[PDB]
PDB file of C-alpha atoms in Angstrom:
ATOM      1  CA  UNK P   1     131.686  87.234  98.248  1.00 57.21           C
ATOM      2  CA  UNK P   2     130.606  88.434 101.614  1.00 56.57           C
ATOM      3  CA  UNK P   3     127.835  86.635 103.476  1.00 60.93           C
ATOM      4  CA  UNK P   4     125.032  88.453 105.252  1.00 57.67           C
ATOM      5  CA  UNK P   5     124.890  88.234 109.009  1.00 59.77           C
ATOM      6  CA  UNK P   6     121.845  88.592 111.242  1.00 60.53           C
ATOM      7  CA  UNK P   7     121.023  91.317 113.781  1.00 59.36           C
ATOM      8  CA  UNK P   8     118.208  91.009 116.325  1.00 60.10           C
ATOM      9  CA  UNK P   9     115.401  93.540 116.113  1.00 59.36           C
ATOM     10  CA  UNK P  10     115.899  94.176 119.772  1.00 60.77           C
ATOM     11  CA  UNK P  11     119.524  95.129 119.149  1.00 59.45           C
ATOM     12  CA  UNK P  12     118.769  97.821 116.542  1.00 60.42           C
ATOM     13  CA  UNK P  13     118.875 101.534 117.480  1.00 60.28           C
ATOM     14  CA  UNK P  14     115.465 103.160 118.319  1.00 58.58           C
ATOM     15  CA  UNK P  15     115.582 105.237 115.086  1.00 59.11           C
ATOM     16  CA  UNK P  16     115.686 101.978 113.121  1.00 64.32           C
ATOM     17  CA  UNK P  17     112.584 100.902 115.019  1.00 64.20           C
ATOM     18  CA  UNK P  18     111.010 104.216 113.938  1.00 65.10           C
ATOM     19  CA  UNK P  19     111.932 103.520 110.301  1.00 59.39           C
ATOM     20  CA  UNK P  20     110.480 100.056 110.369  1.00 57.15           C
ATOM     21  CA  UNK P  21     107.233 101.422 111.841  1.00 59.86           C
ATOM     22  CA  UNK P  22     107.098 104.045 109.108  1.00 61.86           C
ATOM     23  CA  UNK P  23     107.621 101.468 106.380  1.00 62.88           C
ATOM     24  CA  UNK P  24     104.723  99.420 107.872  1.00 61.94           C
ATOM     25  CA  UNK P  25     102.535 102.546 107.748  1.00 62.79           C
ATOM     26  CA  UNK P  26     103.597 103.723 104.314  1.00 62.16           C
ATOM     27  CA  UNK P  27     105.075 107.042 105.562  1.00 66.45           C
ATOM     28  CA  UNK P  28     105.569 109.832 106.255  1.00 64.86           C
ATOM     29  CA  UNK P  29     109.263 109.737 105.430  1.00 64.92           C
ATOM     30  CA  UNK P  30     111.704 112.512 106.149  1.00 65.71           C
ATOM     31  CA  UNK P  31     113.802 112.327 102.956  1.00 68.38           C
ATOM     32  CA  UNK P  32     113.020 112.334  99.315  1.00 67.26           C
ATOM     33  CA  UNK P  33     115.048 109.180  98.703  1.00 67.00           C
ATOM     34  CA  UNK P  34     113.026 107.157 101.227  1.00 66.22           C
ATOM     35  CA  UNK P  35     111.276 104.462  99.268  1.00 68.16           C
ATOM     36  CA  UNK P  36     113.397 104.534  96.128  1.00 68.79           C
ATOM     37  CA  UNK P  37     114.677 101.380  94.553  1.00 69.08           C
ATOM     38  CA  UNK P  38     117.994 100.051  95.881  1.00 68.25           C
ATOM     39  CA  UNK P  39     119.934  98.633  92.983  1.00 68.51           C
ATOM     40  CA  UNK P  40     122.206  96.225  94.853  1.00 67.04           C
ATOM     41  CA  UNK P  41     125.009  97.045  92.392  1.00 69.54           C
ATOM     42  CA  UNK P  42     127.756  95.520  94.510  1.00 63.40           C
ATOM     43  CA  UNK P  43     125.920  92.192  94.812  1.00 63.41           C
ATOM     44  CA  UNK P  44     126.068  92.067  98.600  1.00 63.17           C
ATOM     45  CA  UNK P  45     122.385  91.128  98.964  1.00 63.40           C
ATOM     46  CA  UNK P  46     120.887  88.154  97.120  1.00 63.74           C
ATOM     47  CA  UNK P  47     120.397  88.741  93.446  1.00 63.10           C
ATOM     48  CA  UNK P  48     116.856  89.684  92.435  1.00 63.48           C
ATOM     49  CA  UNK P  49     115.184  91.553  89.682  1.00 61.85           C
ATOM     50  CA  UNK P  50     115.348  95.303  89.852  1.00 59.49           C
ATOM     51  CA  UNK P  51     112.663  96.694  92.100  1.00 60.43           C
ATOM     52  CA  UNK P  52     112.913  93.936  94.593  1.00 56.34           C
ATOM     53  CA  UNK P  53     114.748  96.143  97.054  1.00 55.83           C
ATOM     54  CA  UNK P  54     113.882  99.621  98.372  1.00 55.84           C
ATOM     55  CA  UNK P  55     115.872 101.881 100.698  1.00 55.68           C
ATOM     56  CA  UNK P  56     114.887 103.960 103.719  1.00 54.37           C
ATOM     57  CA  UNK P  57     116.837 106.370 105.917  1.00 56.27           C
ATOM     58  CA  UNK P  58     117.507 105.565 109.549  1.00 55.85           C
ATOM     59  CA  UNK P  59     118.106 108.873 111.255  1.00 53.77           C
ATOM     60  CA  UNK P  60     121.477 109.252 113.048  1.00 53.15           C
ATOM     61  CA  UNK P  61     120.908 111.297 116.239  1.00 56.21           C
ATOM     62  CA  UNK P  62     122.888 114.547 116.017  1.00 61.21           C
ATOM     63  CA  UNK P  63     123.736 114.369 112.300  1.00 57.32           C
ATOM     64  CA  UNK P  64     122.992 117.317 109.995  1.00 57.20           C
ATOM     65  CA  UNK P  65     122.942 115.124 106.885  1.00 57.74           C
ATOM     66  CA  UNK P  66     121.131 111.858 106.131  1.00 55.56           C
ATOM     67  CA  UNK P  67     124.121 110.044 107.492  1.00 54.81           C
ATOM     68  CA  UNK P  68     125.004 106.442 106.587  1.00 52.21           C
ATOM     69  CA  UNK P  69     122.328 104.310 108.341  1.00 48.52           C
ATOM     70  CA  UNK P  70     119.648 102.634 106.209  1.00 48.58           C
ATOM     71  CA  UNK P  71     117.010  99.866 106.083  1.00 49.29           C
ATOM     72  CA  UNK P  72     116.746  97.954 102.815  1.00 47.11           C
ATOM     73  CA  UNK P  73     113.512  96.014 102.390  1.00 49.92           C
ATOM     74  CA  UNK P  74     112.997  93.041 100.082  1.00 50.94           C
ATOM     75  CA  UNK P  75     109.714  91.930  98.417  1.00 52.92           C
ATOM     76  CA  UNK P  76     109.023  89.155 100.963  1.00 51.03           C
ATOM     77  CA  UNK P  77     107.159  89.925 104.160  1.00 54.43           C
ATOM     78  CA  UNK P  78     109.535  91.070 106.936  1.00 53.78           C
ATOM     79  CA  UNK P  79     112.658  90.706 104.755  1.00 55.01           C
ATOM     80  CA  UNK P  80     114.737  93.693 106.027  1.00 50.79           C
ATOM     81  CA  UNK P  81     118.414  94.489 106.087  1.00 52.10           C
ATOM     82  CA  UNK P  82     120.221  97.022 108.175  1.00 54.58           C
ATOM     83  CA  UNK P  83     123.369  98.902 107.246  1.00 52.65           C
ATOM     84  CA  UNK P  84     125.226 101.425 109.298  1.00 50.94           C
ATOM     85  CA  UNK P  85     127.965 102.237 106.785  1.00 53.13           C
ATOM     86  CA  UNK P  86     126.162 103.256 103.645  1.00 53.88           C
ATOM     87  CA  UNK P  87     125.924  99.808 102.118  1.00 55.12           C
ATOM     88  CA  UNK P  88     129.443  98.525 102.805  1.00 55.60           C
ATOM     89  CA  UNK P  89     127.956  95.780 105.006  1.00 57.98           C
ATOM     90  CA  UNK P  90     124.535  94.386 105.832  1.00 56.32           C
ATOM     91  CA  UNK P  91     122.818  92.287 108.379  1.00 58.31           C
ATOM     92  CA  UNK P  92     119.394  90.666 108.046  1.00 57.21           C
ATOM     93  CA  UNK P  93     116.952  91.839 110.674  1.00 59.92           C
ATOM     94  CA  UNK P  94     115.696  88.964 112.857  1.00 61.46           C
ATOM     95  CA  UNK P  95     112.237  89.842 114.228  1.00 62.69           C
ATOM     96  CA  UNK P  96     112.152  86.767 116.555  1.00 62.80           C
ATOM     97  CA  UNK P  97     114.840  88.185 118.867  1.00 63.80           C
TER      98      UNK P  97
END
């Protein structure tokens, strides 16, 4: 009961580009929670079995904490979602734009 919009890769902040690069490489990640399973408890992303989704920090420039920006990856190649509000809303990353 909220759809998922789309955001163009080109329109993401440079730190999100950094995160995506790190996920492609397998690390290194700055925070201990980077790579843990995202449970999708609120049902905002499509329902899958547990383990389908993993979460990664997107650094917020000038923040002393992990902040609220994240990439969630799904099991399918290039299936990535960006949130800037600690999972209150998501947009699917569109690599073709």
